[PDB]
Symmetry: C2
Subunit: 490 residues, 2 copies
């Protein structure tokens, strides 16, 4: 269901508000080895462990955007988009990932052509420096963001950002240092469903030698050190009175399981372990109190000089919202003990509350339940607790299932009203939040293109534009994308 | 300052401002007023010892060997309450004056169960409901000298005697008293007795400046507190089957300072929460749900004992009414977890400081005279709303509230000024009015007790402070005179 008068109209938001779509470098690029591109960490994972991909697939082609960016810009423009959020392949720019491994010239040419073409068509680029693709070269030289020396990674990351600032600084006016560090670290060294795939012994991931209790924090700590270092560099030599830098946090809105004041407390620790873990540091200069008290020693401290670079190290914040959960309290005692870094929030995240019903109508996959109301909740917390800063909904959408046993007909795939409904609703929620005081300034539909979904392989289509992989990645606009064209063009 | 800015005439609390069933009274402490520490073979309490062997720990070196010698003037005491039209009267029973050994083997003091016996009937013969406090910091030196008192490691050598000093009370008294209070201000007791050691016996960690610097400021306060909690459920359960009655009620008295964030930051809001926890929740949460509050279990960790499920049962819901002792409030400023900070007292586990001055330099409220009471009636409302909205909105009795006029050797307080306590009158009228606003807001408060119906001994403060609404002439025959406050209260109840 949906509704006539309740349908978001472009003239519901200010003119300067921005609307666009987003994608990930590894998910759409392909050309995994074309033109001297280095081996990313995911290239390795997929190739050597196809048994960690729901369908054993990989992104050696993706949506072949590396060769078809011309059309990607073409869709966007006929869709009348205001901006395009894409990410840059660290391996494609720095094959060895280091300054001295050399700067691959082809990769620079690509992002220049894409950026220029996006600009000639009046589309603003919102670039994500790092979107999970860590050069495999660094992965073996000192264990990527798992570097316990805190320096190699920070310097190797900082130099990468500098190269980006140097070759795309005049055209790119909006930067994002990292994309969802909470996940990346949690999924790469906690559950281990992400590359490299480490985890505590006994658990089931590719390299069960890791430590789901101490690794996520180590990698996440470096990330924050790299952000502060890159942003320091940005503010000192590249920042213009009209350019911005920041980062995107993954986030699900938490809600009390029952009614006990205990579940409200769980909710708080939940928002903390999820959003605050990385937000609090870039805002005040240190992690959430809760975490320092529940993960005690397993969470490094920061030198005063670091606490200083991190605080206020942003002009805008990116929010990636999909669903929400119920947070039920879990008391401290001898009967319980944390398995994952995430179990430190001494709270469980349910989908179904005490009434047995789902926190929202299922959207098709194993985790997306529609609850746009949690979106407003998050927008009010940013507003009332963390200074109501410029927020951009950098990701939002759903993923239609399309597998071997239950392939999804192209005619049906193209008629995504479950998605069209989902988008309209969240976009309407931004009109409610704005009226409620939020400082949101834009929305990005997740996956302008159908593409690789990490461990989910090609079983899900998140795009608003259909990609025929068994053709020549030919593209066909979905109903959602067509509404978005009417929304922007009207 | 000296001048009192009082409430506008129209703003002055009237009696018909509250329901006919609300109750108004005054309160006192056994050791503080009784005196007669030994008369009639009464066992030595822990404070008798402290004061006698350590008069250096008393600001004026005195003790309460006589106090307000109420032991012989209970008739006069009740007569004042009658005149003032008081509805109830809170008081405590002296442990060593029922069992100079706190145990069966030690027996009982005939004249002990006599004193309190007459006291009650007399009170009941004037329409004055009695609210008795089972334990009020007075421990029989018997137990303290035996197994350290409430520092019992076993968790029963002391849970036995108490459950016995208690049970035996319900025997000779639980027949007239319709409202009981197991303990009074456990937090203060523990933290002051085995943390900063200002309270008998005076145990604080090495390096610290107390009488016996060999204790552990970070653990003892947590064990003594642990014991008191068990001793409570034990007793209460006993009273819930051997002395229970439909028109009776039972609970405990919690001391509590209001908490308000120091600054605008959300970090200070968080500090405030841990502060309400280390103070009120430490003991409240246990009797409400069965276990201490999350924050403490995370900040104090191992130092905070656990409970057996057959204990997490006898504590959960062990009360029909709760007692609140409110005096002042504080600003809670966040203090982060880091290599540069480590706890020294059991109270430092709140990772928060309790300021009196705000970031604007000014006091959270006007100083009332002594070293710690700042008038902030709003804090009382905040508390009542938490009891309401978070802890079930149970029956609350403001069991203590008042101020202490300073009276020392170097700065004697003339009886004339002592008798005109407009600073105290204003403090009471303001807190009483705050209850009227709390009642309209939904709070389930049902009574108010003025702290110290009598001028008396003030623990480590000795006789330097007069908290009474009735002046006591110790340099006479403890002759009593009503202060201006007590006179208004008589008009408030009588009008």
């Amino acid at each position: 269901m949906l509704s006539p008068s309740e349908i978001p109209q472009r003239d519901w938001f200010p003119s300067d508000f921005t609307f666009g779509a987003a994608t990930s470098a590894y998910q759409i690029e392909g050309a995994w080895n074309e033109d001297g591109k280095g081996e990313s960490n995911w290239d390795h994972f997929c190739h050597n462990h196809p048994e960690r991909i729901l369908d054993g697939s990989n992104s050696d082609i993706g949506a072949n955007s590396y060769h078809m960016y011309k059309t990607d810009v073409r869709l966007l423009k006929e869709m009348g988009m205001d901006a395009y959020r894409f990410s840059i392949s660290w391996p494609r720019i720095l094959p060895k990932g280091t300054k001295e491994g050399g700067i691959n010239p082809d990769g620079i040419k690509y992002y220049r052509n894409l950026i220029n073409l996006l600009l000639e068509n009046g589309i603003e680029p919102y670039v994500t420096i790092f979107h999970w693709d860590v050069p495999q070269a660094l992965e073996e030289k000192y264990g990527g963001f798992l570097d316990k020396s805190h320096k190699s990674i920070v310097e190797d990351y900082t130099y990468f950002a500098k190269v980006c600032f140097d070759n795309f600084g005049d055209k790119v006016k909006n930067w994002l240092t990292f994309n969802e560090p909470q996940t990346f670290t949690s999924f790469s060294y906690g559950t281990g469903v992400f590359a490299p795939g480490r985890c505590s012994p006994g658990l089931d991931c590719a390299y069960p030698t890791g430590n789901s209790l101490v690794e996520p924090y180590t990698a996440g700590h470096n990330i924050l050190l790299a952000h502060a270092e890159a942003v320091d560099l940005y503010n000192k030599h590249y920042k213009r009175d009209d350019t911005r830098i920041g980062l995107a946090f993954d986030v699900m809105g938490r809600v009390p399981y029952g009614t006990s004041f205990l579940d409200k407390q769980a909710e708080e620790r939940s928002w903390d372990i999820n959003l605050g873990w990385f937000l609090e540091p870039v805002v005040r200069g240190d992690y959430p109190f809760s975490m320092r008290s529940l993960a005690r020693e397993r969470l490094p401290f920061f030198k005063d000089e670091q606490k200083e670079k991190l605080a206020g190290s942003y002009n805008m914040l990116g929010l990636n919202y999909y669903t929400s959960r119920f947070s039920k309290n879990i008391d401290i005692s001898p009967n319980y003990s944390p398995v994952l870094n995430t179990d430190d929030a001494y709270a469980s995240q349910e989908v179904n509350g005490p009434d047995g019903k789902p926190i929202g109508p299922p959207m098709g996959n194993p985790w997306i339940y529609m609850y746009p109301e949690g979106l407003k909740d998050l927008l009010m917390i940013m507003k009332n607790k963390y200074g109501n800063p410029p927020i951009y909904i950098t990701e939002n959408g759903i993923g239609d299932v399309d597998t071997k046993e239950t392939p999804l007909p192209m005619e049906a795939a193209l008629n995504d009203y479950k998605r069209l409904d989902y988008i309209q609703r969240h976009i309407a929620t931004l009109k409610e939040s704005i009226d409620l005081g939020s400082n949101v300034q834009g929305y990005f539909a997740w996956s302008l293109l159908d593409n690789f979904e990490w461990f989910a392989g090609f079983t899900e289509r998140y795009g608003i534009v259909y990609v025929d992989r068994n053709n020549n990645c030919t593209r066909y606009m979905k109903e959602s994308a067509k509404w978005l064209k009417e929304f922007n063009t009207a």
